[PDB]
Structure 1
Amino acid sequence: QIDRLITGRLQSLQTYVTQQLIRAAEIRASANLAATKMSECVLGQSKRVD
C-alpha cells in the first residue's frame, strides 16, 4: 500500500518539479530581456526600433 502511495506521490512531485523548471526557464528568459531593457533603455538611448 505504501509502495502504491509512494510511486503516485513521487510521480506527482516529479511532474511539479518539471513544470517548475520549465517556468523558471521562461522567467529567466524574461529576466534576461528585462536586464537588457534596463541596460539599453534606461542607462542609454537605444536606436533599436520598438
Structure 2
Amino acid sequence: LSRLDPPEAEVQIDRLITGRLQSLQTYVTQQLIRAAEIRASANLAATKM
C-alpha cells in the first residue's frame, strides 16, 4: 500500500487475497474431515460406555 499507486496495489492485493482465502478453504476442509473422524471415534466410545 505504501509504495505503489492504487491501480497496481489493486492487482497485488488481489493476488494476496486469492492466495490467503485459498489457504483458509484448505484449512477448513481439513478440519471438516478430521472432525468427521473424531465424531466416528466418539460414537464408538459412547457405544462402549
Same fold (TM over 0.5): yes
If the length of structure 1 is used for normalisation, what is the TM-score? 0.75
Share of identical aligned residues, percent? 100
Q: Which runs of 5+ in 1 are unaligned?
A: 39-50
If the length of structure 2 is used for normalisation, what is the TM-score? 0.76
1:16 counterpart = 2:32: no
1:34 counterpart = 2:34: no
Matched pairs, number: 38
1:5 corresponds to: 16
Q: For 2:42 and 2:13, locate their aligned partners in 1 and report how far apart those are by CA, in whole Å.
A: 42
